[PDB]
Structures are given as C-alpha cells and as structure tokens.
Amino acid sequence: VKPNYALKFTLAGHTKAVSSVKFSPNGEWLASSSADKLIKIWGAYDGKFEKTISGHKLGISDVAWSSDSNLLVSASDDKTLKIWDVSSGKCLKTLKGHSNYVFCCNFNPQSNLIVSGSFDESVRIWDVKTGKCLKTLPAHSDPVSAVHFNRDGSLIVSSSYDGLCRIWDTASGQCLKTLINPPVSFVKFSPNGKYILAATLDNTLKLWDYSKGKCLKTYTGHKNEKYCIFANFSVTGGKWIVSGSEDNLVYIWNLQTKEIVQKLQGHTDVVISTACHPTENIIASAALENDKTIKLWKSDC
Ligand SMILES: O=C(O)c1ccc2c(c1)ncn2C1CCCCC1
Hints:
It is classed as transcription. The entry lists the keywords WDR5, Myc, inhibitor, complex, transcription. This protein is mostly beta strands. Helices cover 0% and strands 52% of the residues. It contains no helices and 28 strands. It has strands at residues 6-12, 18-23, 29-34, 38-43, 49-54, 60-65, 71-76, 81-85, 91-95, 102-107, 113-118, 123-127, 133-137, 144-149, 155-160, 165-169, 175-179, 184-189, 195-200, 204-209, 214-219, 231-234, 240-243, 250-254, 260-264, 271-276, 282-287, 293-298. The radius of gyration is 17 Å and the shape is globular.
C-alpha cells in the first residue's frame, strides 16, 4: 500500500550543484554529475566514496551507464560528451559535434550506441566503438531536455522545451510520432516500452500510451516549474513513480491510482535528481546549493 523509505546515508563531496544521479545496472555503484565538472562514484549500499572522474572543461548535466556497468557517458556544457572507463577513470572518447551545451545522454541496452540531446535543438546518435556521430536528427525547435532508448534499442524518445515528445526509429532516424504545450523537462519509456513518462514545467508528470498517443495518468502535488527533474519507475517492490521536487521533498506516487504514497523529508533545498536501485528498494536523491548532499534511502517494500 505504502513504502516506508527512511534515510540511511548522507553523502557530500561535490562543490557545485549536482545535476544527475544514476545507479549502475549491476547495483554496485551510484554515479553523480555536477556543475563542478566532475563525476563521482559512490558505493550504492553504504555510500562509500569511491573515486572522482575528471576531464570535462565545463559543468556536466547528465551521466549514464552502459549495460555491463563498465562505461559511463557524460553530457557537458563544454559541448561534448565523454565516454569513460569507470575502473580506470580514463576518458576513452570525446564525442564532438553538438554546437551548444549537451543536456542529456543514454546508452542503448546493447550499449553500442549513445543518444544525446542538446541546447542546439538536435538529437545525435553516436557509435560507442569509434566515437563518431552516426546521425544528427533535427529533432526539436528548442533545447532537448531528455533522450532515452526503449527496451530493445529500436526506438528513441526525446523531449524538449518546445513542448513536444518525439519517438524516433533508431536505425533510420525517422520520427514515428509526436505527442502533443508546456515545456517538457524529462521523458523516458516505461520498462515494457508501451508507455512514456513525461515531466512538464507546470508541476505535472504524465504517463502516455505510445500506441494511442494519449495521456493515461497524471501525477501532481509536487513543485516543478523551473528545474530539469527526472522521474523514475520504481519496480523492485511496489510499482511507484518517484520524482524530486522544488519544495525539497522526494515524491512517490502509486503508478495506477496516482495517489501520493510517500513524501521523503530531509533535504534542505530543491531535490534535483532521484534514482532507484535495480534490485533493492533503495532511492538516491540529490539536493541543490543550500543542502549540497546526496541521500540514500531504504524501504521495506
Ligand atoms: O512495466 C511497465 O512498463 C508498465 C507500464 C505501465 C503499467 C505497468 C507496467 N503496470 C501497470 N501499468 C499501468 C499504468 C497505468 C496505465 C498503464 C498501465
């Protein structure tokens, strides 16, 4: 009926705003990115600081893991993405081509491709092995806020401040659907690929049916009018939607009923990012400059 997330650890180390937190697919690590130009790696279970990964020339908006947990990609205001070997901390490739800040990034499940979105209004698809751009999609008419591959890698969903979410065939780059306009600040496919979760800067999350192009559920009660705040499908226990919020709380909703089931109190600034652990009922959350911490929470269900 309700989870009971409780605070387990508070982590500190970044020196400017955190932008993203992500658990590795193998469950071992949490990665964080920051405006301080750094990626930090932390133990997923006890929060133990592991390493700092450095090389970008300006702040980082997003980081994402390869499926085997060995690689990270980061998206930076320096107009590049970087592919990193996590074990060595070394930059393997610098992905050059965007003409403005890179805001979002993700590997496909196969992890042979990366997708990126930029302030330059394009979505790019990159070959991981060569580090070269394969396609540039003229995807949007305003900054691209999120990019995500579906469960088998065959489709990409993008979102933009232009108010649109677009679905693309990965192999051909063709736009198969546009969901119709408040700025869309985040989007991702549901685990089964049939639905799309989208955040808009009007304090609203929406669950869309891809095949019907129609909104099925809305989730409200939180505050989101300014920042790029991701939303997650929590699937290890009860089926929830999880999101940060501009009122310093983590919100958790019942996916089916849309009711709020928990609000996590503890942060002292906007909760800018949350992530859900792949096997345990564990949430990571990060707050802005008045707070400066990442918090790890645990629920029994
Ligand atoms: O695993 C998934 O991707 C997934 C996606 C939507 C799911 C689900 C699982 N279980 C129930 N739903 C509802 C949510 C509200 C309407 C759509 C059906």
